[PDB]
Symmetry: none
Subunit: 90 residues, 2 copies
């Protein structure tokens, strides 16, 4: 079927940044997700115009870019079913 | 009875919201009745790795009142003077 596009936006390299990335990779390891989800990690400090462009304040923030509508969730992604529900990835 | 108010504004780059937060903070601190000894430093997080985690920073722009204790903070472009003043407990 059609792809789900995920972008994880973080500030630098911290304890919370690291475990949000691991948690995302864990979530998308689900066989139902592993071949349909494309994930990018975006450091806000490495493209200086992104926080303004995506209107990002609080981080880490996971944004499901595709398919529309965009869905967002703030935090370290430590609750799988919470993330899936919030991003409508059921 | 003079006591220094120390403010640190942490931003990411030279975006519109960074610009807003900086000039808004400057306007807020321009009030001579607000603080005796108002000291402000603006930190670009992009050029200072490690600072974000040390200040528990997860949102930008963010303004942190280091002095006087206890530490207070507020997130955003600081476009509301009164919210900012009360949030940092500067009366």
């Amino acid at each position: 079927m059609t792809r789900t596009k995920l972008k994880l936006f973080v500030i630098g390299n911290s304890a919370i940044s690291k475990r949000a990335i691991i948690n995302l990779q864990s979530i998308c390891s689900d066989p139902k997700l592993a071949d349909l989800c494309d994930i990018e990690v975006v450091d806000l400090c490495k493209n200086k115009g992104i926080a303004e462009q995506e209107k990002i304040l609080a981080t880490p923030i996971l944004i499901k870019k595709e398919p529309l509508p965009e869905r967002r969730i703030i935090g370290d992604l430590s609750d799988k079913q919470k993330v899936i529900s919030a991003l409508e990835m059921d």
